[PDB]
Design an enzyme around this catalytic site. Structure first.
Site, PDB file in Angstrom:
ATOM      1  N   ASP A  12       0.944  -1.290  -0.057  1.00  0.00           N
ATOM      2  CA  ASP A  12       0.007   0.068   0.034  1.00  0.00           C
ATOM      3  C   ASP A  12       0.872   1.245   0.083  1.00  0.00           C
ATOM      4  OD1 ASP A  12      -1.053   2.013   1.733  1.00  0.00           O
ATOM      5  OD2 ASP A  12      -2.623   0.978   2.649  1.00  0.00           O
TER       6      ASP A  12
HETATM    7  N1  LIG Z   1      -3.992   3.325   2.545  1.00  0.00           N
HETATM    8  C1  LIG Z   1      -5.167   3.113   1.396  1.00  0.00           C
HETATM    9  C2  LIG Z   1      -4.430   3.323   0.116  1.00  0.00           C
HETATM   10  C3  LIG Z   1      -3.599   2.308  -0.194  1.00  0.00           C
HETATM   11  O1  LIG Z   1      -4.072   1.170  -0.081  1.00  0.00           O
HETATM   12  C4  LIG Z   1      -3.157   2.708  -1.604  1.00  0.00           C
HETATM   13  O2  LIG Z   1      -3.904   1.886  -2.633  1.00  0.00           O
HETATM   14  O3  LIG Z   1      -1.946   3.003  -1.903  1.00  0.00           O
END
Ligand SMILES: NCC[C@@H](O)C(=O)O
Ligand SMILES: [Mg+2]
Length: 240
Positions: A12
């Site tokens: 993420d």
């Molecule tokens: N923290 C949420 C967004 C994240 O999962 C991303 O896709 O970069």
């Protein structure tokens, strides 16, 4: 189960590596000024967080700037304001200004010596390049919402990633999915059979911030309060 069992970290980005909360609070200031009210950071973040994932369901193939423009419109509507096109553009093009957390570059550069580093992010390819210039590493693989045609937590985002890494010789058991978001990342990682590391950036704050509320508490395999703390853990795990 230990950090050295894995060949790849899948990340993420926004809320884990990039401090999207600082970015969103800053970018909402002009719209907020029109309301006459002083909002707290958490109030700004939570109205974003009630609206971003719905928007990504509404327009699953949209580029991220278009998501953000439409989230601006949603927020403006909760606040009784007509959208202003120039203000909408300034909000929607703000990812260029969303900073890395202060530990991120050092941690990523360290971890790049020991793992394949992969992005699985709710972003499009070109927009992500702007953030990647703030992250200090070459990612081995980058999977974006644009590549998949949907946003996390759609299960197809995870299948796409897992498949891509299998083709690069990384079996699913080799992956450690590393993320803040319980909603976007660790619930679908559970469902996908992945091992999870929770980077609890908000550990010392209230609620979920910009992140959508999760429907349940998924099962995570590691927790670190920051990326630096994950890197420090790995430096000792590597000695075993
Ligand atoms: N923290 C949420 C967004 C994240 O999962 C991303 O896709 O970069
Ligand atoms: Mg709509």
């Amino acid at each position: 189960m230990q950090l050295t069992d894995f060949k790849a970290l899948t990340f993420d980005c926004y809320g884990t590596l990039i401090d999207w909360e600082t970015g969103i609070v800053n970018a909402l200031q002009p719209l907020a000024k029109r309301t006459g009210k002083t909002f707290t950071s958490d109030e700004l973040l939570e109205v974003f967080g009630r609206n971003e994932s719905p928007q990504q369901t509404e327009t699953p193939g949209a580029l991220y700037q278009d998501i953000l423009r439409a989230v601006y419109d949603r927020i403006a509507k909760e606040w009784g304001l007509e959208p202003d096109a120039a203000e909408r553009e300034e909000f929607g093009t703000s990812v260029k200004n969303w900073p890395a957390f202060p530990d991120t570059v050092e941690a990523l550069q360290y971890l790049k010596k020991h793992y394949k580093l992969v992005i699985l992010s709710n972003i499009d390819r070109n927009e992500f390049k702007l953030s990647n210039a703030k992250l200090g590493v070459e990612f081995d693989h980058i999977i974006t919402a644009q590549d998949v045609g949907s946003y996390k937590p759609n299960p197809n985002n995870f299948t796409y990633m897992i498949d891509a890494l299998a083709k690069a010789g990384i079996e699913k058991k080799d992956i450690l999915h590393t993320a803040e978001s319980l909603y976007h990342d660790h619930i679908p990682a559970n469902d996908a059979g992945l091992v999870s590391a929770w980077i609890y950036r908000r550990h010392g704050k209230e609620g979920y911030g910009a992140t959508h509320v999760p429907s349940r508490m998924p099962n995570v395999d590691f927790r670190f309060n920051s990326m630096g703390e994950m890197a420090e853990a790995h430096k000792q795990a590597l000695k075993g």
